[PDB]
Amino acid sequence: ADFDAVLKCWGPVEADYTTIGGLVLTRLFKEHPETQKLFPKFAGIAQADIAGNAAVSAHGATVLKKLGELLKAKGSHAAILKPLANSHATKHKIPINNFKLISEVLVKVMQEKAGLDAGGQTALRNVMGIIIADLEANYKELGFS
Numbered sequence: 001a002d003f004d005a006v007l008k009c010w011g012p013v014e015a016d017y018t019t020i021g022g023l024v025l026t027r028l029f030k031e032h033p034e035t036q037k038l039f040p041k042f043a044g045i046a047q048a049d050i051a052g053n054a055a056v057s058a059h060g061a062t063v064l065k066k067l068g069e070l071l072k073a074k075g076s077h078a079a080i081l082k083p084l085a086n087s088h089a090t091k092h093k094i095p096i097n098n099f100k101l102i103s104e105v106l107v108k109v110m111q112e113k114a115g116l117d118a119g120g121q122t123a124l125r126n127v128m129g130i131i132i133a134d135l136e137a138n139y140k141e142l143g144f145s
């Protein structure tokens with residue numbers, strides 16, 4: 001049910017993955033500047049120049065498209081989530097806490113831009129908690145606990 005609650009508000013996100021993706025990453029980097037440093041392609045870009053940056057927005061679109069896949073899987077997602085854990089642990093070297101940070105930014109952005117109400121905010125927190133716990137379990141299988 002919590003997947004369906006999120007999907008009832010995904011229309012504005014999928015309508016403009018570029019704009020909303022750029023919103024998410026810009027906010028992530030502004031509020032959690034240590035996360036920017038984890039993207040070598042973006043690390044060191046002055047904060048005031050991130051909102052207008054087309055490459056940042058394009059990567060945000062990649063992120064949100066992947067999350068939309070997952071959502072549209074409703075919890076049976078191992079062929080999608082295991083590769084994501086593998087690349088984020090072993091290629092990108094992302095500590096697992098950072099996924100909680102981006103998921104809170106996403107809740108705020110969906111509240112502001114996608115009509116996600118109080119119950120939908122809780123639903124999204126729950127779904128992101130499922131995703132993050134699966135990522136964490138796969139990190140541990142790789143030796144990153």
Ligand code: HEM
Pocket residue numbers: 035038039040041059062063064066067083084087088092094098099102131
């Ligand atoms: C649930 C949240 C997230 C999703 C859905 C997601 C999705 C993606 C996808 C689909 C890619 C490209 C394919 C791949 O390399 O696996 C990617 C790349 C990347 N992600 Fe994530 N990601 C998430 C969270 C994060 C966080 C929290 C960070 C850092 C704070 C991060 C850092 C990166 C980096 C550095 C790349 C490589 C970008 C490049 O070289 O072009 N990701 N992510």
